[PDB]
Amino acid sequence: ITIDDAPYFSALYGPARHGIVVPDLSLVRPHLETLEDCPEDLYLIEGDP
Amino acid sequence: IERGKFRSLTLVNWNGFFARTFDLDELVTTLSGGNGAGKSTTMAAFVTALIPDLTLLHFRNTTEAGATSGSRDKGLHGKLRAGVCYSTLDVINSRHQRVVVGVRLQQVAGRDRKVDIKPFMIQGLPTAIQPTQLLTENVGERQARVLPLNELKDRLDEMEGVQFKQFNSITDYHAQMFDLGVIPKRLRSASDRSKFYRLIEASLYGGISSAITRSLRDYLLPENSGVRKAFQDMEAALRENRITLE
Amino acid sequence: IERGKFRSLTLVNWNGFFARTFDLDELVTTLSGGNGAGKSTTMAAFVTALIPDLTLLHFRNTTEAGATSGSRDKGLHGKLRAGVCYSTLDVINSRHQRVVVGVRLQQVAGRDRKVDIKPFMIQGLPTAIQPTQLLTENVGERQARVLP
Amino acid sequence: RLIEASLYGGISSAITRSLRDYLLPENSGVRKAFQDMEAALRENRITLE
Amino acid sequence: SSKSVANIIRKTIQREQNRIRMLNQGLQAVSFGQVRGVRLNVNVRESHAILLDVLSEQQEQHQDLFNSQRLTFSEAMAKLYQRLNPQVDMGQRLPQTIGEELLDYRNYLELDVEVNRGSDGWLKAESGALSTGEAIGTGMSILVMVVQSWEEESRRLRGKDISPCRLLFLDEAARLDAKSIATLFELCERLQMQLIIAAPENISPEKGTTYKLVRKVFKNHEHVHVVGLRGFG
Amino acid sequence: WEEESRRLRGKDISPCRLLFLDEAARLDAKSIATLFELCERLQMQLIIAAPENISPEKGTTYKLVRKVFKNHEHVHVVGLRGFG
Amino acid sequence: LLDVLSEQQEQHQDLFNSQRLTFSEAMAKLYQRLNPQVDMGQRLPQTIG
Amino acid sequence: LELEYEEFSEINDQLAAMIEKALLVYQQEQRPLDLGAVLRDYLAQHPLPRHFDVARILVDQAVRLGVAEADFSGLPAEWLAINDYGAKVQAHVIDTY
Amino acid sequence: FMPVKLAQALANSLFPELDSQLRAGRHIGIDDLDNHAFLMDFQEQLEEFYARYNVELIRAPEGFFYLRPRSTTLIPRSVLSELDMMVGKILCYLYLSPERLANQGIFTSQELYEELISLADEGKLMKFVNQRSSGSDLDKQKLQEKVRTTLNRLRRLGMVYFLPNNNNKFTITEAVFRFGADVRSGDDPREIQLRMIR
Amino acid sequence: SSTHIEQFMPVKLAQALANSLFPELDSQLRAGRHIGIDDLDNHAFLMDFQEQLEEFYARYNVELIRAPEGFFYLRPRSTTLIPRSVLSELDMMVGKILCYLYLSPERLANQGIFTSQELYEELISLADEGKLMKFVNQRSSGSDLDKQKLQEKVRTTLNRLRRLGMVYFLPNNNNKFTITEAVFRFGADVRSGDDPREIQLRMIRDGEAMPV
């Protein structure tokens, strides 16, 4: 993304800027209990990567 | 949307052209005239204004199109005339800002055939003023007087809102041209200038360029930093330690 | 004194030409046609028939003219088809003698794109004989064959 | 060289560079007299060396 | 480490292949004499394909060479590359440089230019194996490839509402026949790219602007008379 | 060269004369007129090539057209004449 | 140089009082004798003599 | 088979002849010539598809007659319209014969 | 004078060695990183330099460099033996597709020995060793010795690289294609190679 | 300034390498040919650029050497980039005899033209005939077939010495030939009147000669 839209997008996505896109979010539900090694606040988003 | 366009090309005091302006077409412009009329001269003017680097500029004849450097003459000196000469381009960006870019040319006196070149740029000119008018004085004589850069700077600074920028190095000139969207790539270094000139001159003479063919990956593929900088940072602690030990 | 003249040029089994004969002019002969028609090929056939020295022949593109390149391929092989090929000239001597010079060309089987040349000359041929017919045999219903 | 230069047309670099060799013909009468002096000059070279 | 590096390299390679494939489609069905199409053929070198696969899946067989802290990562890459294909020699150059070479994705790709000539299939474009006009047309094709690639490269450093100008030349344009010129005009028009062509009057393209030149002697000095026409069609 | 060999040649033979020029389209009408008069004054034969018929009122001319035909190629040749 | 070599001592010593011609110059061309700056090779060019 | 033949058309040469005869008067009287007016008047005598060729040939004939002294003034000329459908011409008036 | 880039090229420290090698007839492949890069950089001038010797510097379409002498070569020429071309064409055949899975690029002397014995005709084998020979153990031992000898000659040419140990196991380089057949549109390499070997 | 020959090479060396004589000479030199005073072109060339050539060839780990008699030749070092080889003992016998023939004022009247028969006669006059015959065949005892075999071997070795530049055959007669000063290298073991062992040691140390 260009420098002109960069500040807009960074404000829009806020803390979730560095989340992961995952199109279902139910396939993670079994994996999730294992996450003991991760940032204290993990963000997940659904959509076509 | 609304790609920019080159609008016109102006020659002043070149061999056969005292003061001439060509209005370029949006798609195709065709130069036509008998042998020796001066067509290749106009294209020489265009490219020299575009890339004012005397190390690269070499207008060899169309016959012998692919030979070595050969002579020490670059073929440019003879196209000028005694005194001061100019070559300028007029451009319209996607923003519809009118910018005039060009160079001042002069024959350096001596035994050898050498040339002196100085780039410049003007912004904010009214749409009502043409380049030929800026660069000439309509004195009483039959023929006007071409005015040097000092007179030009004084004349332009008098205008309201018009800015005249005069460059000391080619790098700055290319940087400004890129920022305004006149060229597709910002010529970081001399190597970039060489490749850009290769592109232009290969198009000019025509044919499958040998140099383009050799280094195809160097031309068609962008260089990606992501794969590297991680490992430069991770490698840093070892690099410093090794240097300290030495 | 009456200076000699080139009467005609004949090509057999070249790339695009099966058996064609161009009749030259006393002063100027022009070849026209769109790109890729075969004009430069005709030039090349003529010069090959004139100087068969394979060390010299080197047919560069018109672009890249004057660049001493040492290219891997001299550009002659591709202008020939499989089988036997010819290129001949008919000349009228100052003595009003008809002489036919020429060469037999043939591709060499093998990875290297090499070519074989064998010159020859004919004297005293009757004026009524055309080289196109002399070099071919009429086999079948107007379906002639070339002969070694 | 002559035919190839004609075919591609223009001022052939090789032709002009050696124009003496292409235009001026050789003379046998000059050689016949110079044979004697050639012997002499060869001998002088010998000695010099 | 290991797999993730392989994945980023693979994705970069895949994206480059796809972009090239998109550029490639714009050049289908271009008529230049007997040439009917042009392509940029992209392939992956074997000696690097096997290395990439090994780094992806056999890492437990070489982990000693990767976690040894006496040598850095790029050095590890160079040493692994020499372990495979042992016949390769190294020109007394530092393993660090060979490592950084392995880190650069472009080194994994092999590039060619091909043309669909006449009755034949796809052939590598050699100048000596083409007529004059075909060579000129192929050159123009590759040049527009370069220009499109460069514009895609730089747009991440340019304003959102800026579109650079595009212009190319052709000297002694009389060398092209009408059909080829029609093809070239179609290409440039579809690419929004300007052209300046010179011809000694032999060609009269109806579209665009035309300038008539005549050089004269006036007051014992050389002078060029210029006239212009445009708007026809 | 012809003058040099005057001694060796038999008295009664004058050798043939012939030259080429590809991409003749690079020359304008005045230049070609000059070239033709030069070569005819010297009894010199010429063979020239150009995409378009640049010499309509002098000498002979041939027009070449290439046809793709049954998975091979064939060249068709037809002559041209100054007036009709 | 042809004048220098052609005209000999006994008769032309009265002619030799001109500033341009002398005998020693034939040996002075020994310097030029060793190697002229010839460029392209065919047949056999060698030296001033 | 035996070689066939094809012939050229001389329509453009005839066109050049009419134009040169029509234009000779300007030189003989040394009358100032303006390309705009002349082209506008002369294109009216032929149909639209042929206009381009007529314009080209007329310019070829006109430029041989003298020069335009205004060219040394540093002042560009305007693009004059010469017919409908939008054709334009750029040239200074011819004064010095 | 002399072209500046040519003087630069032959001033390089790598030139003497490469010169020595090339004059010997060695082929430079993509394996020799530095030499191959050097040739890629200075080809335009090295071709002219070696043309002065009536010897041609060729870059094969596969990528490897080598010298080809003319009839007027200034460099003394030498010629390979029949058995040498036989083995070379065998190696070209072994540069196959199943090779990758069969040997992972590393062969042994026995592979070549057995392939040669299996694929060639007996008459030309006898012509190779000696016409008086007939299917005897000593003849086969002599043929093995000759195979090792010619294989070392080829290693000198750069065709085949021995793995660095005393045992006779090696890998085949791309430059072996010089022995290969002519390729026509759609033709299968195995078939054409076998057709010539027959 | 940049892009200037002097940056990479001395002007005189480039001037030498650009000469039309160089490829011939180079080729020959590498092959082991000795260069004497008679082949003017070559000799003169050598003389003109001696030091540049020496410096050049040094790159190869080979010495371009000049014997006192005025003849040039190549001597490779132990680390040589170019292979090194040794002459056969029969070549030495013919070499030392050719040397004595060159010196002999008794035959100077021939103007340098000698015949294979005269060479053979001189050789058998000095060396042990029957013991030397051992090299032709282990069973030789003075039989004429063996004597003709010896003469043919001499004829062959003499032809090898011609390729080395040590002797030149007549233009039309191959039974006669002329000597050159390059033959004096066969006297390297005796030109100084000192202990033969020490001389031999010195020579092997300098790389001039090997034992057998």
Ligand SMILES: Nc1ncnc2c1ncn2[C@@H]1O[C@H](COP(=O)(O)OP(=O)(O)OP(=O)(O)O)[C@@H](O)[C@H]1O
């Ligand atoms: N460096 C130079 N020195 C002297 N005269 C020159 C130089 N360059 C061009 N000229 C002359 O300027 C005139 C115009 O040359 P130019 O190359 O522009 O012609 P042109 O119209 O492009 O011709 P053509 O299309 O036939 O090549 C010619 O007389 C040419 O001789």
Ligand SMILES: Nc1ncnc2c1ncn2[C@@H]1O[C@H](COP(=O)(O)OP(=O)(O)OP(=O)(O)O)[C@@H](O)[C@H]1O
């Ligand atoms: N060596 C070759 N191998 C394969 N095809 C070739 C070779 N040389 C020429 N051709 C093809 O033969 C056809 C005739 O080419 P040629 O150059 O003779 O045509 P032309 O009419 O002279 O064209 P132009 O005027 O554009 O030079 C073209 O398709 C060219 O691609």
Ligand SMILES: [Mg+2]
């Ligand atoms: Mg021009």
Ligand SMILES: [Mg+2]
């Ligand atoms: Mg052609």
